[PDB]
Symmetry: D2
Subunit: 265 residues, 4 copies
């Protein structure tokens, strides 16, 4: 199944996010790298947040070569609140938007551990990164957003947070489920200051994780997808662009699946 909906270049590169400073976590690989690409294409300045300085610097060099938006490095572990704040403030920029995309889904020899064999320290690390890392950026940035009465937040859930995916472990499902109600609650607290908070729940996206899934499983997942293909990272990025744009100006608290019909709930 091929791609059917192609956005013309003149629309793809419109400066919809000019004069915006957008923090993107997990931006050096995968969906986060595609989200960074899309915001730069829309003329935003992006903060490239990821773990390894070389990965972050390479990403900034790639993006800055496009002659569109600008990319600045923010190398840190999002679960370390003080290190995150220090790396954000080292840029000298004030970020009006955060896309929380960093996330982990640990496996062992390619398979997720079941709850009865799950190491507590693995559970805790996944909670720290997937859930508390998303709180951390929001705690860091919302004082400024509230004072400015201006801000946009997009979090990343998963269809596995709303129904069972046999590909993930229980910590992943629990943390992605947490994001949904967290996003509603945040939308209510921050709405009075005109700040909007939404989440994306991707299904199965063409990403490095695909090679780690057994080929029969990926085949079955595509068979379980009405649109009959994996999603592209750029399609998730299009949703993050829209949720942070003036064309979703009354949309808040929502979790939008980006999944082609897979595992609807």
């Amino acid at each position: 199944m091929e791609l059917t909906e192609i956005t013309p270049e003149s629309l793809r590169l419109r400066p919809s996010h000019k004069e915006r400073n957008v923090l993107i976590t997990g931006a050096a690989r995968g969906i986060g790298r595609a989200i960074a690409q899309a915001f730069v294409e829309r003329s935003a300045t992006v903060g490239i947040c990821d773990l390894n300085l070389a990965d972050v610097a390479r990403t900034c060099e790639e993006l800055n070569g496009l002659g569109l938006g600008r990319a600045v490095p923010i190398a840190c572990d999002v679960s370390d609140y003080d290190a995150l704040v220090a790396a954000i403030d080292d840029t000298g920029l004030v970020f009006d938007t955060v896309v929380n995309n960093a996330g982990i889904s640990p496996k062992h020899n390619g398979v997720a551990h079941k709850v009865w064999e799950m190491a507590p320290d693995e559970w805790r690390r996944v909670v720290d990164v997937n859930l508390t890392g998303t709180f951390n950026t929001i705690r860091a940035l919302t004082p400024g957003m509230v004072e400015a009465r201006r801000g946009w937040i997009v979090n990343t859930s998963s269809v596995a947070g709303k129904t069972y995916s046999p590909i993930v472990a229980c910590h992943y499902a629990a943390t992605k489920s947490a994001i949904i109600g967290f996003t509603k609650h945040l939308a209510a607290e921050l709405g009075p200051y005109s700040i909007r908070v939404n989440a994306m729940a991707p299904g199965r996206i063409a990403t490095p994780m695909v090679a780690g899934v057994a080929p029969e499983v990926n085949a079955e997942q595509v068979k379980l997808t009405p649109m009959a293909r994996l999603g592209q990272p750029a399609e998730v990025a299009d949703v993050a662009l829209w949720l942070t744009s003036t064309e979703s100006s009354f949309v808040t608290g929502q979790t939008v699946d980006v999944a082609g019909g897979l595992y609807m709930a």
Copy 2:
């Protein structure tokens, strides 16, 4: 609370929906009229479907005066399948998109009847219009969409279909609830042909219905809205534009609230 997110004109009038034929039901007043405005502004051809020929013709004259997209008249009752098909085909156009916006919410002296006083014929009429009218356009248009492997559908639910609103009667809540699971099911049936199906669930929108609600009730509803205002019809229209655009190309089966945080569920 004033509007904070203003889309520049150069983006508002971009020809994102050029060469698209978009059927809009309930297009002569309210949110549907704003949806028709938005699609014409994006260079689509729109089929103006509403009950009264004079209302429909006036709407087409207004829209065609903009020098952007084109509007054609489709005067019919969406609950009458044969009359709907006849009015669609009288235009000589093939519609690749339908926005099901027509809906009714009957009240008596400004108040909704409770279930224990609800006339069965009133229940049935609301079901006929709100639910079966939405099926009718989809039944009429999906043979062509499936054959073309091309099509977009947007339905209209309500936050009252997912949680209780004291402003509506039970037929309204039931029909708007129906839309949510109907939309998921349709997305799964039509996805193999690359057709996407989504729904919008508006909260409280600045529309003629506002005057029919007691002022204390509207005041309380705005107080229950985190973003502290009614939504604008154009903000719902922005969501319909996006859900029918190439920038939501992997989004299907979703119900997106357009409600500023009111009655999140």
Copy 3:
């Protein structure tokens, strides 16, 4: 290699406790399938049950079978639940005041075992499914809530489906839409009727052994690795109408063994 054995057996002493003594319970679709098992369960709990279904002979036979149990009592209510006037007349003819209704009547039309897709669906078929599954459930609630409200006493259980919350390839779009309608209808009713102490809930069954490769695939998709039994749906309807769910209202509880969770 598919179906697991039953693991949770209620003892007879507890199965037959008079938990619903002095209750009058209307059950639609009661002549066969899940509805027949719901009727059996309420009679076992010493309730009086109204057996509502289409065919008088089927309804009369069901009443005779249940009344032979020597526990609760069963009375006949032969009518099409989508016909409000006929429903009211049939209820009136029993002389009973029903404090509870379990809306179980429902249809899922297929054609030689295959559901029609939306693009090929006859509008008359869509309308009939809406009339029975959705408006038939409204009809009983409209008929009975005046009395329930006046008494500040009543219990309602509606029947949704996992297919109303996510896609089941076994059903057509009218079924999905009507079962989806029940979920928000049930929340709305719970709020309207709550001030009068009336509770309103719904059940969303998965795949229940009622009236083969398709069922094997459904079992493969069910974590608990079996079909549900009609009596297990009946246990949920008993609980949702009992004093032991006294603060539970507006809820849709799946009865599905993990199938199609949403």
Copy 4:
């Protein structure tokens, strides 16, 4: 002018039926509030209960009170549920194999009665709420599911909240996030554990009279026009661990009288 009287009274003969005889049920947060009422209910149904809470004196007093009822039995399990090793050691010290756990332990920190907003929230406070409400619930499930899986027998009930599905202005964001986590965690567990006949469900209470203008506003928002009683939450936990919910798994059932339905 707010609270309605109780309308649905379970008779004593049915309240004290031995529905959970020969069951070993671990209850976290059992020394007060809803957890104490859950413990009371299981003992009334002749179960053996593990009373898990922080303070040994509180836990010992609770066991003494319950054991004086002459029905089920209560054993002490004093530990912080967020400490996996301490939890396992305290369970091991009872010498009991628990076939059921009700995860009720939870915290909702406030400051002089007001929840902190996200922009002013101490990260340490967020982390502690995550550790107790979410990871503490994982900890008991990790400790007990090896035995449940090996036996192909077990029941789990977790505790969410209506605030995990929609906004409650009474709670802070950590509470909302952790209670939201429980819903999808429960579905995932139901699927993983279902092949072994283990059922996993959750309760989402609304506003329960546990440890005034704020509560009056909550009653005004509740269709049934009263606070819930702890025993009514306990009735749901009894049912979800009983043979009469034998095909129900992965579900989150609100216990809220219509408050904040979502």
